[PDB]
Amino acid sequence: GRYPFPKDVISMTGGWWANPSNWKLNGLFATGIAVGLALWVSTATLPYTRRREGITSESDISKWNAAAGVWRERHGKISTGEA
Amino acid sequence: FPPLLSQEDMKKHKILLAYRDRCAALLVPLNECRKKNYYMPWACGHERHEYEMCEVADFQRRVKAMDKLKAEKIEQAKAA
Amino acid sequence: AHVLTKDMIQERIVALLESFDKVNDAKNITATANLTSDLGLDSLDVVEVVMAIEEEFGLEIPDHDADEIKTVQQAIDYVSAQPAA
Amino acid sequence: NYKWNGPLPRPHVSAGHRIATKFLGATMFFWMFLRIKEEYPAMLGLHNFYPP
Amino acid sequence: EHQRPELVSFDDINYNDHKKVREAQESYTREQFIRLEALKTVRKALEKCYEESGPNHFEDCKNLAEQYLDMLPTHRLQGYLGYQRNDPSK
Amino acid sequence: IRASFDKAEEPMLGDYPDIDPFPAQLKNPYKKYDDQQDRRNLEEPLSVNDDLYDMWSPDRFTHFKNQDALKYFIGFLTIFFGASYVATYFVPEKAAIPREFPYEGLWKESGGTEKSKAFFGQRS
């Protein structure tokens, strides 16, 4: 279409047809940030990740159920289906 | 007619709730067979045919059950 | 893309009225002819003409400009006045 | 626009699109003829599972 | 530094000095957080049961699951006012 | 003038001219107003309760009458749900049994207790 547009206002998105001249140059910076962002984050998030299945033993969780029974018998609790 | 698994056998292989029956015996290598591959449908077809045939033989006794369910349903109408 | 010209609008209306049957002639038609008298068109015929004019151009028009375009040059300058080709 | 109120010409398409039409149209019916043949007892519905 | 100030009841502390009253309020407060940490820890363990178990969590940690659901009404903030403004056995 | 609330807003005004309201969307667009975005010439006496006759007012479909169209919608409701309930009397029963389960219906597998067997157990 290419209708005339008032070039006075400065928008954060650039405006109507932002085609600035050093786009070959400034893209060397932002992508240099972008890659430089991502690998910097991915290492930092690395010790915060974990494998879901198989983090502890079944023996630990079964002893936790044993501790549940020891707790619940001391409180004297009926089952969910007992009436 | 494959044999029934033990209790620990259901507790070990982490078989889903609905799948645990008499016919689960062909299942526990089958998924394991699937573990060797990456769920590709051209692979591991004979044993899923085995599991299916196990279950179709179960289907025929399911149907013969439901057939047996209806004769006395007629006989209750024959009470007069 | 593509941009409309004046002579396109010219030849379309000429070849348009060549295909209509209640015209007077195939040689009387000019860029300045009356639709009604110079082509033998009725009050009711010119509306079917304008219906074909609007469908063939793509662009639709109201009834307010319908009796405004009584000659050929009026219709040409009208349709050239709109940017929707 | 050369023709007005006459027969429209044969359209001109480029070779690279029409070869892709030929290619994908070949692969479609080829894949159909694979899968229908491979499941022809099952896909059509045969060998009922009810004991006679 | 992980300090440990003492626990003071609301019974027999003579509600006129602000010292013992405020200490009892803070004691019944911080101890209630201690009571809350049981709920938080058993939740942290119960989700790990669900992580490892897969399908058989129904029978692995049924007692842990109903442990969580039993602790839920009795482990929360409840206000020091309710025990402070009233007296049982009266 | 037009609607019920419009006539129920008449005795409030004392010095407003009480014009006839009309939805500007339902004015034709091919008349050339000042505000082509709103089909509005500049010094136009606005309506008491303008914003139900703005372009920014809701759409106000014009083909069916409102009270008439309500009947068509509830008729579509009735012809669906009633006939679906009729098909419940016309349904055939199925051919096989629902499948049973070992370990007395896996009541032990869904947690459970012999005392809590009633809230478990699937076709033992």
Automatic annotation (TrEMBL), chain A:
The keyword Membrane applies. Keywords: Membrane, Transmembrane, Transmembrane helix. The keyword Transmembrane helix applies. It comes from the Eukaryota. The chain crosses the membrane at residues 27-48. This is Uncharacterized protein. It comes from Yarrowia lipolytica (Candida lipolytica). The lineage of its organism: Eukaryota, Fungi, Dikarya, Ascomycota, Saccharomycotina.
TrEMBL record, chain C:
The lineage of its organism: Eukaryota, Fungi, Dikarya, Ascomycota, Saccharomycotina. Pathway: Lipid metabolism; fatty acid biosynthesis. The keyword Hydrolase does not apply. It comes from the Eukaryota. Signal peptide: none annotated. It is found in: Mitochondrion. This is Acyl carrier protein. Residues 7-83 form the Carrier domain. GO terms for cellular component: mitochondrial [2Fe-2S] assembly complex. GO terms for molecular function: acyl binding; acyl carrier activity. Carrier of the growing fatty acid chain in fatty acid biosynthesis. Keywords: Electron transport, Fatty acid biosynthesis, Fatty acid metabolism, Lipid biosynthesis, Lipid metabolism, Mitochondrion, Phosphopantetheine, Phosphoprotein, Transit peptide, Transport. Belongs to the acyl carrier protein (ACP) family. Its main location: mitochondrion.
UniProtKB/TrEMBL annotation, chain E:
The keyword Transport applies. Keywords: Electron transport, Membrane, Mitochondrion, Mitochondrion inner membrane, Respiratory chain, Transport. It is found in: Mitochondrion inner membrane. It is a peripheral membrane protein. Disulfide bonds join C49-C61. It comes from the Eukaryota. Its main location: mitochondrion. GO terms for cellular component: mitochondrial inner membrane; respiratory chain complex I. InterPro entries: NADH_UbQ_OxRdtase_su10, NDUFB10. Belongs to the complex I NDUFB10 subunit family. This is Uncharacterized protein. It comes from Yarrowia lipolytica (Candida lipolytica).
UniProtKB/TrEMBL annotation, chain F:
This is Uncharacterized protein. One of its GO terms (cellular component) is mitochondrion. It comes from Yarrowia lipolytica. Keywords: Membrane, Transmembrane, Transmembrane helix. The chain crosses the membrane at residues 70-91. The chain holds residues 25 to 148 of 149 of the full protein. Residues 106-124 are annotated as: Disordered.
